[PDB]
C-alpha cells in the first residue's frame, strides 16, 4: 500500500549512524540521509576518520556514501523529502525535578516530533529507534495528534535497535530478530508493512516480529533487563567463588551447558557499562513507581545494586593489596572504554574504578587504544583540580606501567594479553600487582607468576 524510497534519520550517533549505513548498503534503491545537530560529528561521518570506532563500519560507509547514503546538518530539508523518518536521538536521565536520577528526559524526542510537524506535508512514517525506548512512541503520537493539518498524515512506529557496540555491523547484517510496533489499525498496518519491506531486503521474514508500539517498547525494556541480569548474576557468583576457592569461569561453563540457560553473557567482569543497561533498569524502576508496582521495581533494582557492589569490591581489593594506602602511588589503568572494540566510555566501569582510586590519592596512568584523551579527562572531571593532580593519559601501555605498583585491566582489549610482561615487571615496583577485571589473562597466570607478579582476578581466590 506504500513503499519507502527515501529515509531520513534524526541522530547520527552509535545507533543512527551504523543502522542507516547498513540500510543504505543493503537497499541501493533507497536514498538514506543521516542528520544531526552536531556539525563536527557530521563532518567526521563525511571524512576518512569516522566519529565512532566500529569494526567494519568504515568499509560500509565508504561503499555507499555519496551514492545513496548521505550525512548532513540540514535536518529540516531531510525531513521534507522523506517518506520515512527515524528518530535516533539520546534521552538523558533527568538531573532535577520529579524522577531525579531515574526518569528519562524526553525533551529531545519531543523536539524532534515538533520539528517533524514543522517540515512535513502529506504522508510520512515516523519511526523511533533506540536501545532504550522509554514511552517514546506515545510522546510522539500525542504531539502529532494535537498538530493536525489539511492533507498531513503522520504515522508513528516503534522499531527498537538490538545492536551492541563493537559488533554493530555484524548485528545489523544478521540480527536475531527485527521488532516493529504499530497501531492495530489500517493506517498502522500499512506503515508496519512498509517498514517490513525495507528490512526484507536482507532480513528473512520469519525473523521480523510485528506488534503494537507499547508491546514493542516493553519487549526491548524487558530484553535489556534479562541481559544485564545475567551479568549481575554471574558476578554475584564471582563473589561466591572468591570466598570459597572456586573459579567463576569453570562454574560459568557448567552453567552455560544447560540449553535452557545458554552459554552467552556469562563472563564475569568488574561491572557492566554502557548507555543502555543502567539506564534501562532505572527507567523500569521509575515506570513501576507510576504504576504502583514496588515489588517489580525492587526485583530489578538488584541488578544495579549488584553491579555497584561488584565495582566497589574490585576497587577494595586493589586498595587492600596496597596496604590500604595509595597516596602518591602510580597505578596503570589499561582500558577505559566500557567494552572492547569501541571508543565509547558511557557508564564505563573504568570511570568508577578510577574515581575510587583517585579518592585514595593514587597517581593514575590510563591507556586505551581507541578512547580519545579528551574524553577520559571529561569523564574523570565530571562533578578539574583532582584530575590535574592525579590523572595522566599514556600513549602506550609500557609508559603507563613504568614505575607502577599495580596494573589494572578494566577493558577486554585483546592487545593486553600480548604485552611484554617481562619488560613491565622489571620497571615496576615490588610487589607488582596485576588486577584482571576482565579475565583476559587466563591461561597466562603460570607465566605471570613465574615472572614475579601478584595476579588477582575476578572470580578466583
Ligand X SMILES: O=c1ccn([C@@H]2O[C@H](COP(=O)(O)OP(=O)(O)O[C@H]3OC[C@@H](O)[C@H](O)[C@H]3O)[C@@H](O)[C@H]2O)c(=O)[nH]1
- Tell me the backbone φ, ψ of residue 59, rounded to 5 degrees: -70, -30
Q: How far apart are the C-alpha atoms of 144 and 159, rounded to whole Å?
A: 18
The 252-281 site mask, x for binding ligand X (CB under 6 A), equals -------------xxx-x--xxxxx-----
Nearest to 351 by CA among 363, 327, 362, 335: 335
Residues 99-158 that bind a second copy (CB under 8 A): 99, 103, 105-107, 110, 135, 139, 142-143, 145-147
361: contact with Cl ion by CB under 5 A: yes
Q: Which of 1, 29, 40, 96 binds a second copy (CB under 8 A)?
A: 96
**Among 36-44, 173-181, 370-378, 415-423, which window interacts with a second copy (CB under 8 A)?**
173-181
Contacts of 329 (CB under 8 A, 6+ apart): 322, 361, 362, 363, 405
Q: Is 161 a catalytic residue?
A: yes
Nearest to 136 by CA among 171, 108, 167, 164: 108
Residue 230 CA to its chain's centroid (Å): 16
Q: Is 276 a catalytic residue?
A: yes
Q: Which is nearer to a second copy, 107 or 427 (CB)?
A: 107
Residues 122-141 that bind ligand X (CB under 6 A): 130-132
Please report how many Cα atoms fall inside a 13 Å half-sphere around the Cα of residue 58, on the Cβ side: 9
- Tell me the backbone φ, ψ of residue 108, rounded to 5 degrees: -75, -40
Q: Note whether 129 and 87 are within 8 A (CB).
A: yes
337 annotated ligand-binding residue: no
Q: Is 20 a catalytic residue?
A: no
Full DSSP string of 365-407: EEE-SSS-HHHHHHHHT---HHHHHHEEE-SSHHHHHTT-SEE
Q: Which does residue 99 bind out of Cl ion, ligand X, a second copy, none, counting CB within 5 to 8 angstroms by kind?
A: a second copy
Position with the least CB separation from ligand X: 13
Nearest distance from residue 44's CB to a second copy, in Å?
28
Nearest distance from residue 359's CB to Cl ion, in Å?
6
Position with the least CB separation from Cl ion: 361
CB atoms within 10 A of CB 139: 19
Residues 28-57 that bind ligand X (CB under 6 A): 36-38, 41
The set of catalytic residues is 161, 220, 276
Positions in the binding site for ligand X (CB under 6 A): 10-16, 36-38, 41, 88-91, 108, 111-112, 130-132, 161-165, 224, 227, 231, 265-267, 269, 272-276, 338-339
Amino acid at each position: 500500500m506504500f513503499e519507502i524510497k527515501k529515509i531520513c534519520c534524526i541522530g547520527a550517533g552509535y545507533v543512527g549512524g551504523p543502522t542507516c549505513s547498513v540500510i543504505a548498503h543493503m537497499c541501493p534503491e533507497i536514498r538514506v540521509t543521516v542528520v544531526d545537530v552536531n556539525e563536527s560529528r557530521i563532518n567526521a561521518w563525511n571524512s576518512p576518520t569516522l566519529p565512532i570506532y566500529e569494526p567494519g563500519l568504515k568499509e560500509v560507509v565508504e561503499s555507499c556514501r555519496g551514492k545513496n547514503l548521505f550525512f548532513s546538518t540540514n535536518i529540516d530539508d531531510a525531513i521534507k523529502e522523506a517518506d520515512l523518518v527515524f528518530i535516533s536521538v539520546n534521552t538523558p536521565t533527568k538531573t532535577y525535578g520529579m524522577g531525579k536520577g531515574r526518569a528519562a528526559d524526553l525533551k529531545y524526542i519531543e523536539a524532534c516530533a515538533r520539528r517533524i510537524v514543522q517540515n512535513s506535508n502529506g504522508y510520512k512514517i515516523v519511526t523511533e529507534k533506540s536501545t532504550v525506548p522509554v514511552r517514546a512512541a506515545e510522546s510522539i503520537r500525542r504531539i502529532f495528534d494535537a498538530n493536525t493539518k489539511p492533507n498531513l498524515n503522520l504515522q508513528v512506529l516503534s522499531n527498537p535497535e538490538f545492536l551492541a557496540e563493537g559488533t554493530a555491523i555484524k548485528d545489523l547484517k544478521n540480527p536475531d530478530r527485527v521488532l516493529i510496533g504499530g497501531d492495530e489499525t489500517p493506517e498502522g498496518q500499512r506503515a508496519v508493512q512498509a517498514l517490513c519491506a525495507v528490512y526484507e531486503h536482507w532480513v528473512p521474514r520469519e525473523k521480523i516480529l510485528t506488534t503494537n508500539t507499547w508491546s514493542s517498547e516493553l519487549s526491548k525494556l524487558a530484553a535489556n533487563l534479562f541481559l544485564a541480569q545475567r551479568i549481575s548474576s554471574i558476578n554475584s557468583i564471582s563473589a561466591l567463588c572468591e570466598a570459597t576457592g572456586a573459579d567463576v569461569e569453570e562454574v560459568a561453563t557448567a552453567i552455560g551447558m544447560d540449553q535452557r540457560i545458554g552459554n552467552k553473557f556469562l563472563k564475569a567482569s568488574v561491572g557492566f557499562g554502557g548507555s543502555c543497561f543502567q539506564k534501562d533498569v532505572l527507567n523500569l524502576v521509575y515506570l513501576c513507581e507510576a504504576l504502583n508496582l514496588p515489588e517489580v521495581a525492587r526485583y530489578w533494582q538488584q541488578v544495579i545494586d549488584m553491579n555497584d557492589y561488584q565495582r566497589r569490591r574490585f576497587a577494595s581489593r586493589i586498595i587492600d593489596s596496597l596496604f590500604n594506602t595509595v597516596t602518591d602511588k602510580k597505578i596503570a589503568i589499561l582500558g577505559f572504554a566500557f567494552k572492547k572494540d569501541t571508543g565509547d566510555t558511557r557508564e564505563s566501569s573504568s570511570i568508577y574504578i578510577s574515581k575510587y582510586l583517585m579518592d585514595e590519592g593514587a597517581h593514575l596512568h590510563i591507556y586505551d587504544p581507541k578512547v580519545p584523551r579528551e574524553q577520559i579527562v571529561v569523564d574523570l572531571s565530571h562533578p578539574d583540580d583532582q584530575v590535574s593532580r592525579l590523572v595522566t593519559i599514556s600513549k602506550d601501555p609500557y609508559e603507563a606501567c613504568d614505575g607502577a605498583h599495580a596494573v589494572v585491566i578494566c577493558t577486554e582489549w585483546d592487545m593486553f594479553k600480548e604485552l611484554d610482561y617481562e619488560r613491565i615487571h622489571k620497571k615496576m615496583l615490588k610487589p607488582a600487582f596485576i588486577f584482571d577485571g576482565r579475565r583476559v589473562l587466563d591461561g597466562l597466570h603460570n607465566e605471570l607468576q613465574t615472572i614475579g607478579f601478584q595476579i588477582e582476578t575476578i572470580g578466583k581466590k
